[model samples]
Target: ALRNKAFHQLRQLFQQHTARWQHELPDLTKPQYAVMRAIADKPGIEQVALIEAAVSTKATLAEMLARMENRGLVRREHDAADKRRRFVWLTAEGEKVLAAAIPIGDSVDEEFLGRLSAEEQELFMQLVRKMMN
Candidate 1:
């Protein structure tokens, strides 16, 4: 019969949430957020390993990394023995961006959580955790 309004509302909230960050951070895009957060979480991780960490496909992440490298947000170096294998690391700029971006997301989450009572937020997050599994 009708579409699920709850699902639509959730989608709308997520869209608005991401749009705010995108607007606030003109230079940083969603791709950069994913890659930067992944690298920040696991410094010196391989590009291939980031596929799983970033929840991105090979081709998509490759292009994103290339752009990041061009922007000086990240650097890649080949292994001495294996010139083919490249390791990725965040640059100073990447660290700076990560510092800013992490708080941005945290504040958004805090604001969103603030809308509900503490008990309600706990229950809501519990439900979200259950849904993840």
Candidate 2:
């Protein structure tokens, strides 16, 4: 029974990596970094689309976006055609932070995948993508 419990194993792995991530980047939480990455990848993304890209709930994303805006890490601009719509973009400062964080994030991923062989790593990624969808 325990051997078949992939959910529990995956949860534990996530918790471990989350703890390491927090320790490495105390100034930026995982969700906050996710938001930044999302904005960087899709500049001027609408708030509604950002919620999906960042894998965040509406209220949570709103609060985080407001905090980042106050810190000058990101900006929100109202659409000219749609007054009610807002688009998000990362500031130059946000770009610098993301650039610095990317290497650290990559190292963490490398460490986590270290135990797996190259073929296994490829298979793991494929499986993860399948699960995500």
Candidate 3:
């Protein structure tokens, strides 16, 4: 038991995430949400940038982008400066999708983390932001 506290903590975190997702956006698959978040956050992040930001492999991320691009959910542009890479951005339609999901995302955050006391919530958010940096 003591040997796996970190793993158990990860499970709890995932439970928080999945429960919220299922309740809020039951139709969108996990990968669909991942793509939405990436483009919504950084409209034209290159493949490499997305790999880092989305924590995915280049080949897989590219494939996903291509699919979304075909679906008119994203737009991809070559990097003229680099001449060897492309950046991706959500299409106008994709923006609509992200806009529709925003309130649900907020609801998920509110519901999943509501157990924390107000002070605890503030403190926890501050500490978590450290992880981003």
The number of the candidate with the highest TM-score is 2
What is candidate 1's TM-score against the reference?
0.78
TM-score of each: 0.78, 0.87, 0.71
lDDT by residue for model 2 over 1-133, one digit each (tens)? 6647998888889988888988888888888888889899889988888776667898888888999999999999998899778999999999999999988887877779888999999999899999989
The segments of candidate 1 whose C-alpha lies over 4 angstroms from its true place after superposition are 1-3, 79-85
On the 0 to 100 scale, the lDDT of residue 60 in model 2 is: 89
Off by over 4 Å in 2: 1-4
Give the local distance difference test score of model 3: 0.76
Query: Candidate 2 at 86: error in angstroms?
Result: 0.8
Off by over 4 Å in 3: 1-4, 27-38, 80-84, 125-133
Clashing pairs in 2: none
Clashes of 1: 0
- Best first by TM-score, ranked: 2, 1, 3
